[PDB]
């Protein structure tokens, strides 16, 4: 799989040796080529993984995530190259270096075949993100956002390292294959209870679970647009990947240890979804919607059925694409009016019609309109939950209605009504922004054409 890893490490010096006015062109072109190359991982087998070497492997769960990462980097470049125009060439190359390092760490993370290497890269992803947020953010809250993000992650991730070394000493290996084949049941013990908590809590925080989610609004709101895109699209799914990889050793304790988290994920689903109804800031609204969708994914992983796993994979991919698109759409208005308040610039459909239809399509995808992959994932999770308990349908339906309510509320507030009178600096949409929106949204529909590619290994 080094045929994908090495070209990114070559993106590094090509960026650092390109001339001052062609960094963006070269980065975009070669990132798109790398995504085309990584598209070859979708040819997955039906029984086992693709064991490239002793250190790297791929199955049908990590291949869509890798494709999403490689595809997201060019979108991040295109959206970033607007607000960094006045920046010096050295710091622009530094920003591109941060993005490239993030993509490389994610690529190795999604394919590491043993748990300690996966942990090392999963934590290494923190440094470029923190630097991006706290160096290229706009307001003075970026420092606190970075602190919250970093310490929320590490507080949950250090016990995971302790538990991982404990497991390796007790069993002898941490390779995913050996771990799966030699799996043994976990007894109902206090020691096993705390081992379960240590193995689960890092990925709980990374989702984030409701209650441990207070870092996400700060981090996603204070970050630059590329940081927000990478946080919402990919970095939230590391928790889901780790959860669905490490739950193979936590049975049968999960059957009764998932009871609290499930509740926190279900009721929390409602609570965050209600917060979006009263958000005066667009970015915070998008962040809280991300929290609710991730709560649904947590339920899917915790109930641990094949339909739930397929739904979780589909929902992870669909939410990544949708949230990235929503953040980019909000950023266009932000660069227009330099304010994040939703009611400031109103009636934008009159002045930006094509951007208005992008807004409509993004909102329709967000509220899970059939036959999008968003709906496929949500519906599979809902059916799995109904099999788990028939009373869950009440909470799921409440969440569906509130999701539609706040999605269309945001669309109506920003796009419809009458324009604000004094705002006269709304220029026509650039080709770059429309191309960015189209490149976000076309893969979503092309994927609902062939959904088995994002349904995971349980398919």
């Amino acid at each position: 799989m080094l045929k994908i890893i090495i070209p990114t490490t070559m993106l590094l010096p090509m960026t650092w040796m390109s001339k001052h006015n062609m960094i963006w062109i070269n980065a975009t072109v070669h990132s798109l080529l790398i995504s085309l190359i990584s598209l070859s991982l979708l040819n997955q087998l039906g029984e086992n993984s693709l064991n490239f070497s002793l250190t790297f492997f791929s199955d049908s769960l990590s291949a869509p995530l890798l494709v999403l990462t490689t595809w997201l980097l060019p979108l991040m470049l295109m959206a970033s190259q607007s607000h960094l125009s006045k920046e010096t060439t050295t710091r622009k190359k530094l920003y591109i270096t941060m993005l490239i390092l993030l993509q490389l760490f994610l690529i190795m993370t999604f394919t590491a075949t043993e748990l300690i290497l996966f942990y090392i890269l999963f934590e290494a992803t923190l440094v470029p993100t923190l630097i991006i947020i706290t160096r290229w953010g706009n307001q003075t809250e970026r420092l606190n956002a970075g602190l919250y993000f970093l310490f929320y992650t590490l507080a949950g991730s250090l016990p995971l390292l302790v538990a991982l070394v404990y497991i390796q000493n007790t069993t002898g290996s941490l390779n995913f294959l050996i771990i799966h084949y030699w799996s043994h049941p976990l007894s109902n013990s206090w020691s096993n209870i705390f081992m379960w908590l240590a193995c689960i809590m890092a990925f709980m925080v990374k989702m984030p679970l409701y209650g441990l989610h207070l870092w996400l609004p700060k981090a996603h709101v204070e970050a630059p647009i590329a940081g927000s895109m990478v946080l919402a699209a990919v970095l939230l799914k590391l928790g889901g990947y780790g959860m669905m990889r490490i739950t193979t050793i936590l049975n049968p304790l999960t059957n009764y240890m998932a009871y609290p988290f499930l509740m926190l994920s279900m009721w929390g689903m409602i609570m965050t979804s209600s917060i979006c109804l009263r958000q005066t800031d667009l970015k915070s609204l998008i962040a809280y919607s991300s929290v609710s969708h991730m709560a649904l994914v947590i339920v899917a992983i915790m109930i641990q059925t094949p339909w739930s796993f397929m739904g979780a994979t589909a929902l992870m991919i669909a939410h990544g694409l949708t949230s990235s698109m929503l953040f980019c759409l909000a950023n266009t208005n932000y660069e227009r009016v330099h304010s994040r308040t939703m009611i400031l610039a109103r009636g934008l459909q009159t002045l930006l019609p094509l951007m208005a239809t992008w807004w409509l399509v993004a909102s329709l995808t967000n509220l899970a309109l059939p036959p999008s992959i968003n709906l496929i994932g949500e519906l599979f999770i809902i059916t799995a939950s109904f099999s788990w308990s028939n009373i869950t349908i009440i909470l799921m339906g409440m969440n569906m209605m509130i999701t539609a309510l706040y999605s269309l509320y945001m669309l109506i507030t920003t796009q419809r009504g009458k324009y604000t009178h004094h705002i006269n600096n709304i220029k026509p949409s650039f080709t770059r922004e429309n191309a960015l929106m189209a490149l976000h949204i076309l893969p979503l529909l092309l994927l609902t054409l062939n959904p088995k590619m994002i349904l995971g290994p349980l398919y």
Binding site: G46, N48, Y181, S183, T247, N251, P306, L458
Partner: protein
């Protein structure tokens, strides 16, 4: 046509009555059918025969892959990883084949229900009982394994069911 096997996708005789009109009025359906076939089916048949004779000029074959019958999870030592891997792959392939068997029976049942019209409740008894048997056996084999299923968990489920059955049978024999 012969593109599939009639024994696995069995169909009825398809007896159709003969047209016996009681009235001398022209039948619009027959005239519309004649116009349709002349204007549509003839060009479609011509194009298909042209494409078929093009395909006949370059004919190649593809084959169905054959798999051996390696030892199963019951013939593997506790920590032998090669035998475990072989048995696990074989079990997963068998699981896929069983899924397709259930799919075939479900297709049979759906086709029977659509074909039989208003008599489906009585005329689709054999298909319903076939589906009941097949689904019962599939549920006995693979249900409740969850995600992270394997040959070992299936074997443990089978062993537990067999232990319960043996205990019940010996209790009954104790009467």
């Amino acid at each position: 046509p012969d593109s599939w096997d009639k024994d696995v996708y069995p169909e009825p005789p398809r007896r159709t009555p003969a047209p016996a009109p009681q009235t001398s009025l022209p039948n619009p359906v027959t005239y519309l059918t004649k116009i349709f076939d002349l204007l549509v089916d003839r060009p479609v048949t011509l194009a298909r025969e042209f494409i078929e004779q093009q395909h006949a000029k370059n004919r190649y074959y593809y084959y169905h892959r054959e798999f051996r019958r390696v030892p199963d999870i019951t013939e593997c030592e506790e920590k032998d990883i090669l035998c475990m891997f072989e048995a696990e792959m074989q079990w997963r392939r068998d699981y896929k084949v069983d899924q397709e068997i259930v799919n075939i029976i479900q297709e049979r049942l759906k086709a029977c229900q659509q074909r039989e019209g208003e008599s489906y409740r009585q005329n689709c008894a054999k298909e319903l009982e076939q589906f009941t048997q097949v689904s019962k056996a599939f549920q006995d084999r693979y249900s409740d394994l969850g995600a992270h299923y394997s040959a070992r968990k299936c074997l443990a489920k089978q062993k537990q069911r067999m232990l319960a059955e043996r205990k019940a049978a010996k209790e009954a024999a104790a009467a």
